[PDB]
Amino acid sequence: NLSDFKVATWNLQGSSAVNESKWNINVRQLLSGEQGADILMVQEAGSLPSSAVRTSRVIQHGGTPIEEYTWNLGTRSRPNMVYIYYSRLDVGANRVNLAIVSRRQADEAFIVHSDSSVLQSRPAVGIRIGTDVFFTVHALATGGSDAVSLIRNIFTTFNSPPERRVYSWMVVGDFNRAPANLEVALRQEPAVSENTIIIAPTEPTHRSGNILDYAILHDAHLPRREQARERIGASLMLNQLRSQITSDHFPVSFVRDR
């Protein structure tokens, strides 16, 4: 079950000027302790931590870049390893990149595009661990207009392969639009709308006061129109912080209700 995992997301807002310190201050804190995330999605990742190491694994199975790295959150004598799946989309300035940090190795990766358009939208990048698939997204700044077709394409990818019919999937990231605004728009795709559930905080996730970071998921264990039975709640991940949050976005976690 997706609910077995502690999933989180954070838009790091990286840049040439500040990037490395953000991974070492905030990302490290989001992954540590008993309540640290098992899977963390990152947007605007910039460059990976300088100590991250590229593995020999090849997942590049298309035009969109995706690479696997390992990163040691501990010391050389007491390692505490995580994998990082990195999609360096921003070849222009190397800042608008996507990443997924996972304790467990991905069995497979997936890249799903939204509808063709003249806008430079970003694809959803994800990893499958067993029967659960996790995506990181960063929708367009102007109302995340690419979000509905992105969600629909992800849906058809798994729910239209034989083995994919039992997969649960979760799309997590910066949707750039209110949860209710996305919810209404998705109704234009009845099958998608009825097979998914938006899980989001009711507290701001950005310093503008807006709620822009959350998740949408499909739990294969639940029937159509019954996804609201999901026992996964969204919350600003404040229990992990021991420092200033170095971006204008607050990390958000998705954890099973206790």
Binding site: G33, P201, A234, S235, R242, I245, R258
Partner: protein, 167 residues
């Protein structure tokens, strides 16, 4: 100690437990803390420099509460929980069924947070300026004030514990 024993790598000490705790620090550096150890006594806020002898009763483990978006605080040393009571906070036996032990933290635009009692609908308030060792901790209307005699902003900070470098 040996990093390599005769038959294999030997595990060095590097505690993960400290990662689970933190302190709630006011703008004046004062940390929300138990003072009188018996259950149901009032909580206060003392900076580390005036409370070294308090030990781990100054550290808390922040966990999600029973309800979505709320948190509860468990004392590192005593295992009791922060609880809204009357016009302040006390610590008492933990129970996921006690709404008074659940708090909503509201982020501010500086990255600090305001702590709101869900049962009372009031925020944790304190006086940054004090003629004594501590700030008095109360509950009052959530206006996000940041004055010398009344402030409601807190920082989610590292616990007061020996730290081990993980570089």
């Amino acid at each position: 100690l040996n990093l390599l024993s005769s038959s294999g790598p030997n595990r060095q000490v590097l505690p993960s437990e400290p990662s689970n705790f933190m302190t709630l620090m006011g703008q004046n550096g004062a940390l929300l803390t138990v003072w009188a150890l018996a259950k149901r006594n009032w909580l206060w806020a003392y900076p580390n420099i005036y409370s070294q002898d308090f030990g781990n009763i100054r550290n808390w483990k922040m966990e999600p509460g029973k309800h979505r978006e709320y948190f509860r605080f468990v004392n590192q040393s005593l295992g009791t929980c922060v609880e809204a009571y009357g016009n302040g906070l006390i610590h008492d036996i933990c129970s996921l069924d006690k709404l008074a032990q659940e708090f909503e933290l509201l982020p501010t635009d500086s990255g600090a947070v305001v702590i709101k009692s869900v049962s009372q609908g009031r925020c944790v308030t304190y006086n940054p300026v004090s003629t004594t060792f501590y700030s008095t901790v109360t509950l009052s209307v959530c206006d996000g004030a940041t004055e010398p005699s009344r402030d409601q902003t807190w920082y989610l900070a590292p616990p007061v514990l020996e730290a081990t470098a993980v570089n």
